[PDB]
Amino acid sequence: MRVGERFTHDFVVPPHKTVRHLYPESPEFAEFPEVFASGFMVGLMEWACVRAMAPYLEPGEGSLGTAICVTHTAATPPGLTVTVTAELRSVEGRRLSWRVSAHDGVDEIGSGTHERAVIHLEKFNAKVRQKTP
Amino acid sequence: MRVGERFTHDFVVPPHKTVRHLYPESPEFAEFPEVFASGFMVGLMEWACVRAMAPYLEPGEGSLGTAICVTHTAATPPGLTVTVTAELRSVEGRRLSWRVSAHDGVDEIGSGTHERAVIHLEKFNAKVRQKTP
Numbered sequence: 001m002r003v004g005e006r007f008t009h010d011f012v013v014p015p016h017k018t019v020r021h022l023y024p025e026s027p028e029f030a031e032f033p034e035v036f037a038s039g040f041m042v043g044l045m046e047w048a049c050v051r052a053m054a055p056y057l058e059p060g061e062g063s064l065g066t067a068i069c070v071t072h073t074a075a076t077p078p079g080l081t082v083t084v085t086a087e088l089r090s091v092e093g094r095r096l097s098w099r100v101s102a103h104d105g106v107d108e109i110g111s112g113t114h115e116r117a118v119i120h121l122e123k124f125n126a127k128v129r130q131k132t133p
Numbered sequence: 134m135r136v137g138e139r140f141t142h143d144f145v146v147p148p149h150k151t152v153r154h155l156y157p158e159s160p161e162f163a164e165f166p167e168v169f170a171s172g173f174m175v176g177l178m179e180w181a182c183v184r185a186m187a188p189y190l191e192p193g194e195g196s197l198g199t200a201i202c203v204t205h206t207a208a209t210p211p212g213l214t215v216t217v218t219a220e221l222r223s224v225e226g227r228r229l230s231w232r233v234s235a236h237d238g239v240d241e242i243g244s245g246t247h248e249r250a251v252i253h254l255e256k257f258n259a260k261v262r263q264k265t266p
């Protein structure tokens with residue numbers, strides 16, 4: 001990949017990406033504005049950086065999110081399309097970090113940075129099986 | 134709220150809180166390890182700061198997350214119990230800033246800062262309604 005490479009990714013927000021759908025088990029979230037949850041916005045931004053990454057993964061490799069630092073500056077109702085935009089700002093071994101921005105057609109809805117770690121799925125799957133109680 | 138308010142919030146990670154359940158739409162996420170997604174973690178960290186400001190909100194008040202900045206430094210299969218510790222670190226007007234950090238009983242899984250904005254719910258819900266195409 002090349003520091004400075006950009007990428008872009010679109011998502012029509014359905015009504016089930018609101019706060020209370022992120023955690024159906026939260027009494028508190030049950031009464032939030034029916035707006036796009038910060039958790040999902042995270043997931044989407046990761047999703048974009050995952051997409052950009054894919055053609056460059058070798059067999060048996062994968063990646064994990066290792067840092068997410070974004071603001072969330074407008075709320076996005078269902079029906080809007082969120083456009084995530086993802087520029088590569090660094091590679092340092094297996095560690096890649098991006099800029100992400102998102103908007104919904106109407107407003108700038110947040111931006112910041114995301115870091116991922118390229119992993120070897122077998123080794124990581126085994127550590128995970130090890131702490132599975 | 135005064136600075137120093139610490140909550141401590143506890144969650145048994147079920148199998149529907151892994152990467153592929155954050156975005157059932159994503160084929161890329163579909164073949165990820167079954168571990169606790171960064172977005173679901175974000176939503177837990179948030180959930181804790183919310184629980185914690187519930188005593189201090191007037192009737193008709195609510196809140197939204199306005200910034201999230203965390204690491205995700207170890208990984209969590211379903212069946213473990215994640216313990217967020219939200220701590221309140223700045224209060225200025227409608228804006229509260231909280232440290233979150235999260236532990237699954239084996240590893241510290243992620244930490245950093247989260248910002249929320251206190252809002253008026255009926256008023257904010259009309260605005261959302263207006264913006265919803």
Ligand SMILES: CC(=O)SCCNC(=O)CCNC(=O)[C@@H](O)C(C)(C)COP(=O)(O)OP(=O)(O)OC[C@@H]1O[C@@H](n2cnc3c(N)ncnc32)[C@H](O)[C@@H]1OP(=O)(O)O
Nearest residue numbers: 019035036037038072073074075107197198199250252257
């Ligand atoms: C953590 C979660 O799951 S929820 C996160 C999902 N949504 C968000 O985080 C929202 C992102 N942030 C916001 O919407 C915030 O910027 C707040 C929290 C809306 C801050 O915006 P503010 O302009 O300070 O006003 P606030 O929403 O508190 O008050 C209600 C109204 O929104 C204001 N508003 C201004 N711009 C916008 C906008 N782009 N989107 C929504 N509301 C807006 C209105 O002027 C009105 O303000 P008033 O109370 O002074 O009349």
